[PDB]
């Protein structure tokens, strides 16, 4: 249709198996909150995250692609196991949801036409694909030890016709290996046959290597004692017979486990190698598709490749790279001649590295996002960037990448992160921009902050985005972190948007002024159109503190009087499209309005009301001066009402029309200009639907509903249109409670 998804900014979770990768097509699917995000790391553009997948009502824990098929199995903390399938080429849909186990899922693995589920009460299950449909029936479940054994990770492979081997691990110092034979209906002879000792702490990760030599392959067993012990599994007629009268002093640690599966397939499992190091706990393990390397990720932000070198025999660290937190998951793939190194940290951001022939590694443009909820959105006053703040102590800067390092327009413009202005520890409730160089923010704190844009960002916003900044010899450079306090201190030739380590420390903005006055934590704020007065309101439940405080942005002090109207806590402030009026929208189901003195900056209560809506009211926005003195108000009672200044009896505003929706509407916006004597209004409600309307004097018109595949998955926090118009397209800024920040385009003549 007309709308097009442009930018998805979602941040990964902190589990050790959030991610997998498809083999033929190269798509990275990582769990991120309640959704399952999809990302393509190889393309001439970068494009960021292109799609998310809905359905879970808790955070996603395990994501695994079924090898050599069109499926994908997922797991979460809502006790459910969902199965996905490709529909055309790069999108998926659920076809089965498991309603079992009554507990969360902690481990997961996959084979062709067979998966395996581990859950947090000591139960290890096996699911099997049947004929004639894509349905997974239950085959067998068991328990190692009832009250004492709790799983962490699972893997399984095949030997030669139908016989499989599964490797259980968790919560103790040993590794459990089972076996089961397949059949036409289900499985049978499922029992535990091995018990692998050697470790000192828990076993966090273990994986099988592919069977390169027929009848001989390896086994990695990483653990929480910083060690990465290996194993080696052989086959029939290659057992390395021992214990004969000419014995070899077998060194009972290498005691060469041995069992039978049924009668005709018997194996031998011995100890191979043992590696120290890693400086801390290790998270994830990966093998290679063809060669004989091994990837390991640790909990001290490190990532190193292990390789058996010649003329020594023993394992040695060949390629090590990485520059607190930790790396949780990691992946490998080769594209044409080189292989890529990608991983994630505690900020929900994907680091990426390229190298040639395992010698020279260099950076590569990765994607990022938030880890907790997104609260507020503020576009630039010229409209080429927007400041998306979140609930995880961060604030972002999202902007397009149009001009490259040379200066040519790229044939597709993509969205990335350029700056991360503040890292200081609060929940960052609200934010609003004043200029292209200054903005005013505020979190759960009794004061407000004010930051200035630095020169190191002004150089690259002018280069890569292509926007003009004049009078640049004044604002300072950028600092790193507040170490002697909490306020930010003062403190080229790039060819790309920056990497993650520059975003963490080398791109914060200096603070110019810290202004006092409220005494409680801030809810919302808004600034006048003439950039002269800032207004704010704090959280309370009392009439004594429900006061709008107005600060002049020159001397950063208070304006003398108070504004004592509301009772509980004000949820929305906006000035008009001129500077004449000022409405307030509160949690006490009523609104107020305040007019300006225009020479003393004093306010007076003029137009009040006491029962506009049934339930409480959330959001409000004004209409342009080409349309009239009009503002709209949404509310918890699943309705939205548009009101106009008319004065036949007296000077007051009265409602014109309304709609009733299905759920409670939480965010509304009006585009700053009109299209052929019609204004554009977009609404958003409490579980992820976004409607956009056209309105003309008491008559609405449902243009279209956004499709369910590209909408947010939780409640809408804000909606703001962009001021700029490029290529005949508009821009909407969407922020929701599914950890995501979205930007939609809309062409409409």
């Amino acid at each position: 249709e007309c709308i097009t998804p442009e930018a998805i900014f979602i941040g990964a979770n902190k589990q050790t198996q959030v991610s997998d990768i498809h083999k033929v097509k190269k798509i990275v699917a990582f769990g991120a909150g309640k959704t399952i995000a999809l990302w393509d790391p190889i393309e001439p553009n970068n494009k960021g995250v292109y799609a998310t997948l809905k359905g879970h009502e808790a955070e996603v824990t395990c994501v695994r692609f079924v090898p050599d098929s069109d499926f994908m199995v997922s797991a979460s903390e809502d006790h459910h196991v969902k199965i996905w399938k490709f529909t055309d080429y790069s999108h998926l849909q659920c076809i089965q949801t498991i309603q079992h186990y009554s507990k969360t899922i902690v481990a997961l693995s996959a084979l062709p036409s067979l998966i395996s589920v581990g859950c947090a009460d000591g139960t290890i299950s096996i699911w099997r694909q049947n004929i004639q449909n894509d349905e997974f029936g239950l085959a067998h479940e068991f328990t190692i030890k009832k009250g004492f054994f709790y799983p962490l990770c699972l893997s399984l492979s095949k030997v030669e016709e139908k016989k499989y081997l599964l490797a259980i691990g968790g919560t103790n110092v040993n590794v459990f290996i089972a076996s089961f034979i397949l059949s036409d209906s289900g499985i049978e002879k499922c029992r535990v046959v091995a018990e692998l000792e050697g470790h000192e702490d828990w076993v966090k990760s273990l994986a099988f290597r592919h069977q390169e030599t027929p009848g001989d392959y390896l086994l990695c067993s990483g653990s929480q004692d910083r060690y990465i012990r290996l194993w080696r599994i052989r086959i029939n007629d290659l057992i390395d017979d021992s214990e004969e009268d000419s014995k070899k002093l077998t060194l009972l640690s290498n005691k060469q486990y041995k069992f039978q599966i049924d009668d005709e397939l018997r194996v031998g499992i011995n100890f191979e190698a043992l590696i120290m190091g890693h400086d801390d706990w290790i998270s994830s393990l990966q093998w290679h598709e063809s060669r004989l390397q091994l990837l390991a990720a640790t909990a001290d932000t490190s990532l190193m490749v292990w390789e058996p070198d010649e003329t020594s025999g023993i394992w040695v660290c060949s390629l090590r790279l990485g520059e607190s937190g930790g790396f949780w998951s990691c992946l490998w793939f080769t594209h044409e001649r080189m292989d890529f190194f990608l991983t994630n940290g505690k900020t929900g951001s994907w680091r990426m590295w390229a190298t040639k022939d395992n010698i020279i590694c260099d950076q590569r443009l990765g994607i990022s996002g938030a880890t907790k909820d997104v609260t507020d959105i503020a576009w630039s006053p010229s409209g080429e960037y927007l400041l998306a703040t979140s609930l995880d102590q961060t604030t972002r800067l999202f902007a397009p990448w149009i001009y490259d390092a040379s200066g040519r327009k790229r044939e597709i413009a993509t969205w990335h992160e350029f700056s991360r202005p503040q890292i200081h520890g609060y929940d960052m409730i609200c934010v609003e921009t004043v200029t292209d160089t200054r903005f005013v923010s505020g979190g759960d704190e009794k004061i407000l902050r004010s930051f200035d844009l630095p020169k190191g960002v002004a150089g690259m916003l002018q280069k890569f985005v292509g926007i003009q900044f004049e009078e640049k010899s004044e604002m300072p450079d950028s600092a790193t972190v507040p170490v002697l306090g909490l306020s930010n201190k003062a403190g080229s030739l790039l060819e790309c948007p920056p990497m993650e380590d520059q975003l963490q420390r080398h791109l914060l903005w200096p603070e110019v002024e810290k202004l006092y006055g409220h005494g409680f934590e801030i809810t919302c704020l808004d600034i006048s159109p003439d950039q002269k007065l800032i207004a704010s309101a704090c959280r309370s439940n009392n009439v004594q503190n429900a006061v709008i405080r107005i600060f002049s942005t020159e001397n950063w002090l208070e304006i003398k009087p108070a504004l004592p109207f509301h009772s509980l806590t004000i949820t929305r402030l906006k000035f008009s499209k001129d500077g004449k009026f000022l409405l307030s929208v509160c949690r006490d189901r009523k609104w107020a309005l305040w007019e300006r003195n225009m020479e003393d900056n004093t306010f007076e209560l003029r137009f009040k009301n006491e029962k506009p809506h049934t339930r409480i009211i959330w959001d409000a926005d004004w209409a342009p001066l080409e349309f009239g003195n009009v503002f709209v108000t949404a509310s918890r009672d699943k309705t939205v009402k548009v009101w106009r200044h008319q004065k036949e009896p007296a000077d007051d505003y009265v409602l014109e029309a309304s709609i009733k929706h299905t759920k409670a509407v939480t965010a509304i916006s009006i585009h700053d200009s009109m299209i052929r004597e019609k204004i554009l209004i977009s609404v958003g409600l409490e579980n992820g639907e976004i409607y956009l309307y056209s309105y003309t004097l008491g008559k609405f018109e449902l243009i279209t509903q956004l499709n369910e595949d590209i909408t947010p998955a939780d409640k809408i926090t804000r909606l703001r249109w962009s001021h700029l118009k490029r290529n005949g397209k508009l821009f909407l800024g969407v922020g929701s409670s599914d950890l995501s920040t979205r930007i939609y385009s809309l062409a409409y003549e």
Partner: protein
């Protein structure tokens, strides 16, 4: 070896008695409504624990993990760690923040990654770096039946209450927010739930003179209402932005000279009974911040030297252990009545060298109290801690052999129950005990 003490601080917040009183405590420094930058309540930001918290930005998974592995870069070789929470009024925080806080305290030892409080403690039970207890400090109006069983789910075993005065006028005039007859009633429901109750006391408060301090602490151990298992002596320090700073400014409050204060605490330790311990004699505040009050930071040894030439030996259970070899030991017990129940204090002692080997607490469950479901279907007796220092090995199994024989015969009980922490739940499973909720009990 020993026990590793890892101290964490929660989010900087406001006490909950600022609303209906109008302000916080008179002597309390710091907090959000102060001039110290980004500091927790009752702290200044210049403490070695409070400087690790600000650099961590109060993230519980990263604050605890940086502290644990720091102590094994020095080389303490830790395998038994006991958490303690401090700062603010942790149980006044919202419910969806408190449970997620405690979950990531357990994940820094086990390695499990999840958010369910009912499942994180099960993974933490078979941990190898194990937690022997969590100390959570609170106010006496936050120990109701709704809050005491939330601490049982969290893994808490010891809790600390700021009493700080036994007079009614002092708890009113310092804007403390409760009554002293209310804290002696919530001690009874806490000790019958199975907690090690430790209280805080503060000498040199306003309007309590020199002589009233010594009958304050004589009453504290003679009255069967209080008789707790621990104390933290916290003498009053005047800080910059506090409420009593203006009383120091206008000349309406003056402090003790540092010759009468060390004489006072040389008499307070003389009355300490052998079943309680003195954790602190003063708190870690850097002396450039303090204006009046305690001069130096060596009040512990100056108090032990002042009672050397008085003939009186401090018989404290923090002082009377190995830190000198026993070569022999006797078995004695002590019996006292504390706030509704019959407490007993079994220990292994040497009366000559005055040194302790092990100790144990046990309580008959009363009838006016004990709301818990597991302690109502029959008459039960509660063992509250076991604490053995360091053949010198079988002192644990002797104290459990004797506390069980004394429960069937002299208490007349049908079930004995332990309040063991999560990491030490497996030491009792070998001795025939079985888990039922927070407790590790057994039918007699």
């Amino acid at each position: 070896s020993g026990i590793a003490v890892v101290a964490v601080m929660c989010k900087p917040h406001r006490c909950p008695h600022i609303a209906y009183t109008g302000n916080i405590c008179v002597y309390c420094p710091g907090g959000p409504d102060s001039d110290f930058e980004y500091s927790t309540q009752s702290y200044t930001g210049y403490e070695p624990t409070s400087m690790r918290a600000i650099r961590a930005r109060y993230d519980p998974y990263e604050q605890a993990r940086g502290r644990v592995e720091q102590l094994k870069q020095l080389g303490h070789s830790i395998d038994k760690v006991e958490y303690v929470l401090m700062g603010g009024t942790f149980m006044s925080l919202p419910k969806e923040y408190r449970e997620d806080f405690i979950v990531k305290l357990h994940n820094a030892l086990s390695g499990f990654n999840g958010n369910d409080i009912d499942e994180a403690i099960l993974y933490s039970q078979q941990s190898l770096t194990k937690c022997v207890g969590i100390t959570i400090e609170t106010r006496p109006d936050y120990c109701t039946q709704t809050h005491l069983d939330d601490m049982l789910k969290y893994g808490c075993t010891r809790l600390e209450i700021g009493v700080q005065s036994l007079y009614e006028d002092v708890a009113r005039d310092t804007n403390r927010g409760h009554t002293v007859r209310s804290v002696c009633e919530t001690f009874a429901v806490s000790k019958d739930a199975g907690y090690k109750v430790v209280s805080h006391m503060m000498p040199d408060l306003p309007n309590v003179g020199m002589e009233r301090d010594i009958e304050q602490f004589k009453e504290y151990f003679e009255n069967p209402d209080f008789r707790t298992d621990g104390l933290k002596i916290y003498p009053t320090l005047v800080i910059r932005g506090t409420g009593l700073y203006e009383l120091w400014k206008t000349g309406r409050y003056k402090s003790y000279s540092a010759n009468a204060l060390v004489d006072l605490v040389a008499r307070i330790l003389a009355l300490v009974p052998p079943w309680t311990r003195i954790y602190r004699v003063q708190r870690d505040i850097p002396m450039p911040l303090v204006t009046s009050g305690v001069d130096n930071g060596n009040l512990r040894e100056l108090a032990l030297a002042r009672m050397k030439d008085l003939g009186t030996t401090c018989r404290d259970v923090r002082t009377r252990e190995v830190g000198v070899q026993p070569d022999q030991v006797e078995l004695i017990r002590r019996d006292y009545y504390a706030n509704g129940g019959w407490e007993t204090f079994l220990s292994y002692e040497d009366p000559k060298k005055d040194i302790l080997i092990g100790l144990l607490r046990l309580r008959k469950a009363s009838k006016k109290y004990t709301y818990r479901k597991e302690f109502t279907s029959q008459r039960t007796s509660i063992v509250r801690e076991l604490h053995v220092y360091g053949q010198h090995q079988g002192f644990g199994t002797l104290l459990m052999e004797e506390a069980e024989r004394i429960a069937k015969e002299e208490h007349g009980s049908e079930k004995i129950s332990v309040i063991s922490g999560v990491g030490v739940r497996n030491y009792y499973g070998k001795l025939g005990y079985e888990l039922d909720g927070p407790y590790m009990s057994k039918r007699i």
